Amino acid sequence: IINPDWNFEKMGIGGLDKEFSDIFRRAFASRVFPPEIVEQMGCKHVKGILLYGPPGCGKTLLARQIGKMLNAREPKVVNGPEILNKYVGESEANIRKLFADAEEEQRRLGANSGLHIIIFDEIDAICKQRGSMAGSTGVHDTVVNQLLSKIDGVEQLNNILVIGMTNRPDLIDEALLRPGRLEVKMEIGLPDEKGRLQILHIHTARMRGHQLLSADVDIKELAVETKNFSGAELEGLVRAAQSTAMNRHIKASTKVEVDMEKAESLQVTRGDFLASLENDIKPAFGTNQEDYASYIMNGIIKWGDPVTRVLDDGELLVQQTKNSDRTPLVSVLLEGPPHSGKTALAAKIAEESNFPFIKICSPDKMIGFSETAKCQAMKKIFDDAYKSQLSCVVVDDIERLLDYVPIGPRFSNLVLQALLVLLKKAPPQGRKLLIIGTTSRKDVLQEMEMLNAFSTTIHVPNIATGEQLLEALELLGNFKDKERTTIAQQVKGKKVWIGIKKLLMLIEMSLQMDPEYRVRKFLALLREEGASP
Amino acid sequence: QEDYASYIMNGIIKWGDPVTRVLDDGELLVQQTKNSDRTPLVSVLLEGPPHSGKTALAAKIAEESNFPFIKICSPDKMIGFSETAKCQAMKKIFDDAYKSQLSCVVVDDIERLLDYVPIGPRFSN
Numbered sequence A: 001i002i003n004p005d006w007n008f009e010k011m012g013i014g015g016l017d018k019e020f021s022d023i024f025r026r027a028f029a030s031r032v033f034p035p036e037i038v039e040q041m042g043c044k045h046v047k048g049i050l051l052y053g054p055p056g057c058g059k060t061l062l063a064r065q066i067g068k069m070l071n072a073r074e075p076k077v078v079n080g081p082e083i084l085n086k087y088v089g090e091s092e093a094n095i096r097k098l099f100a101d102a103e104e105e106q107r108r109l110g111a112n113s114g115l116h117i118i119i120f121d122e123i124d125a126i127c128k129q130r131g132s133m134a135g136s137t138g139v140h141d142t143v144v145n146q147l148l149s150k151i152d153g154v155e156q157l158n159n160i161l162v163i164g165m166t167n168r169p170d171l172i173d174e175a176l177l178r179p180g181r182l183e184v185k186m187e188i189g190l191p192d193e194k195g196r197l198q199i200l201h202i203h204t205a206r207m208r209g210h211q212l213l214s215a216d217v218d219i220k221e222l223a224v225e226t227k228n229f230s231g232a233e234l235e236g237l238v239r240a241a242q243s244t245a246m247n248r249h250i251k252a253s254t255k256v257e258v259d260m261e262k263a264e265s266l267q268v269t270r271g272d273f274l275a276s277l278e279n280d281i282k283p284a285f286g287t288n289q290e291d292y293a294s295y296i297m298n299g300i301i302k303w304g305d306p307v308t309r310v311l312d313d314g315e316l317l318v319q320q321t322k323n324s325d326r327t328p329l330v331s332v333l334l335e336g337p338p339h340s341g342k343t344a345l346a347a348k349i350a351e352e353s354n355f356p357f358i359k360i361c362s363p364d365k366m367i368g369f370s371e372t373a374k375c376q377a378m379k380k381i382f383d384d385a386y387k388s389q390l391s392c393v394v395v396d397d398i399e400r401l402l403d404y405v406p407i408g409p410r411f412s413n414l415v416l417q418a419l420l421v422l423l424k425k426a427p428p429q430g431r432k433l434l435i436i437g438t439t440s441r442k443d444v445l446q447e448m449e450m451l452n453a454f455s456t457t458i459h460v461p462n463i464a465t466g467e468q469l470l471e472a473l474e475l476l477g478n479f480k481d482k483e484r485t486t487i488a489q490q491v492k493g494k495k496v497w498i499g500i501k502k503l504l505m506l507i508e509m510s511l512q513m514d515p516e517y518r519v520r521k522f523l524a525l526l527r528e529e530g531a532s533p
Numbered sequence B: 001q002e003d004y005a006s007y008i009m010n011g012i013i014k015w016g017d018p019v020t021r022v023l024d025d026g027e028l029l030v031q032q033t034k035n036s037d038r039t040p041l042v043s044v045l046l047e048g049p050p051h052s053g054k055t056a057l058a059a060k061i062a063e064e065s066n067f068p069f070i071k072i073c074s075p076d077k078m079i080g081f082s083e084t085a086k087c088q089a090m091k092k093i094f095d096d097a098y099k100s101q102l103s104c105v106v107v108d109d110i111e112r113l114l115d116y117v118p119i120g121p122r123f124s125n
């Protein structure tokens, strides 16, 4: 019913052109050959397939087009969580209601009926395997059995086709993949440069049709600027550009009584696209420039040699992880005394890598969580990281993730075991990863056998000389000439062990008085904090 | 034949005598478990310092046996599980192993299945 090489273009789906060929070659070879030879051989057709991948990557379009191209009746869409009810023996009824028409048509027309396709969604919701993990989601296992009894069993159905869709391929019941049942898996991953270009081509044909779009805008620049968008973020970008351009044009024309010549024109230009891209759309699988300003609040100032050493070592590690074989997983750990400024340096090192996927997992967003929820969140972040060619994950505080208190001692063992397992699991073939730690108590970590898993260590020291303090003050720029002179005469005493954060706090506290008494207050504050190595 | 090529990532090069001794001992154990009649159940434990290459050698010994049933139970596929889930998984694997006439099972990183930590000590009973 379809031409030998088929056709998939300018009909919607544009990014996935090899997938159709792959699936048709692997599964649907029986429905294209002349029926006489198929009946002569005496073979049965495949009775379903499974699709899995990241959300919003164009799965429903594929199912609808596959159904359309086979000359099948209207698909009977359905959702996963919708088929669930607390009353005993009611979900089975919902599962059973779906096949009535197929049964009736088979009963009437015999062996000449058409093809009916049922499209499920979030099929992993009904499965007696999610109960293994922490929680209670037994979903009254019986449900699944009923479904199987309809795909096969004593009563045979020969005019159906089941297309399953899922996001978590590791929660699918194992009994649902043997031969004779859903038995063809496939992956629909993120698009690439060509896919993004094609999607932008398809989604913008309307404006070009009526010459409304300006000649300034390109499509290659927007195709290369967007790194890990899938499909919906591109549609969102187009829509946001439309809306922003419209609002700006109407407001500007109201502000200035422009002639009808430009009033009729409603060009969107390129500025609207860039503004919407940089302010409107926030990708889920890409870099997030907003969170960096939340950690590096006062920038980075060079008060000594160690900063350059740390930055250079970070660059070397990034280069090693980027282009290298035989070692696709690399780890590192930053250790130092409290208030030394470790989080900011880690964030800077991650930012300078220019990787497409950068994330930060910190306990600031896990207040009141039970340990199981923390394990879930960590696993989710790492699972998301595993779906990109180059990634980078930062773990903010390893001591707070364990709930360590010196009395006892006390802590949670589940999180420790999860971290130890996750630190030594390479990604699927052909993909890289990088992990950066941070902590202030190295001895406890060494004592817990966790330092045997990391690959390197770096040291972040404090300010340990007077001239360094003078240089830091000079860079900050808060004291005058005579003030600096007075400070210099009195701080040559040596044995000066302070942290950058504490230094900032002391300066801020001291600057709350009149200019006369600032110096003595600052010196008193420094002396009360003047411990020794 | 996909797990074995996933656990032996860079082959097995012979840098000294011990490799030959280990492989020969494994072969002798396999032949014993195959040809005996009054000793159907056999066990062996491989131990050594960290980062020494125990899993690769165990996988190679299992693969070079030609048994019709072979399976590996590693802890890296049970992240976030509870004690009961681990018990059920292990029992299921062994129950499946019991239905063949010749089988081999690999248990990997025994110290990570019990959740051992030197402080305490703490673990799962």
Ligand SMILES: Nc1ncnc2c1ncn2[C@@H]1O[C@H](COP(=O)(O)OP(=O)(O)OP(=O)(O)O)[C@@H](O)[C@H]1O
Pocket (backbone or CB within 6 Å): A295, A296, A297, A298, A299, A300, A301, A302, A303, A307, A338, A339, A340, A341, A342, A343, A344, A345, A440, A500, A501
């Ligand atoms: N070279 C630098 N190194 C570190 N911090 C710097 C540097 N230059 C400026 N800072 C400032 O230091 C502060 C970092 O303090 P922050 O509280 O992030 O430290 P931390 O090591 O993460 O602390 P904690 O041990 O509480 O987690 C930021 O204000 C940053 O602007």
Ligand SMILES: Nc1ncnc2c1ncn2[C@@H]1O[C@H](COP(=O)(O)OP(=O)(O)OP(=O)(O)O)[C@@H](O)[C@H]1O
Pocket (backbone or CB within 6 Å): B008, B009, B010, B011, B012, B013, B014, B015, B019, B050, B051, B052, B053, B054, B055, B056, B057, B109
């Ligand atoms: N003769 C050999 N013995 C062991 N490993 C070898 C040998 N020849 C090469 N290798 C390489 O050694 C690596 C195996 O190390 P592996 O990570 O399995 O160590 P391990 O002892 O299982 O570690 P762990 O105790 O951390 O679980 C693989 O790269 C393998 O290619």
Ligand SMILES: Nc1ncnc2c1ncn2[C@@H]1O[C@H](COP(=O)(O)OP(=O)(O)O)[C@@H](O)[C@H]1O
Pocket (backbone or CB within 6 Å): A012, A013, A014, A015, A016, A054, A055, A056, A057, A058, A059, A060, A061, A199, A202, A230, A231, A232, A235
């Ligand atoms: N080439 C394309 N690939 C993927 N999605 C596309 C493509 N062109 C358009 N889209 C849009 O992306 C969305 C993908 O289908 P949708 O049902 O929203 O997501 P999913 O089924 O992946 O959860 C739809 O809005 C669809 O119109």
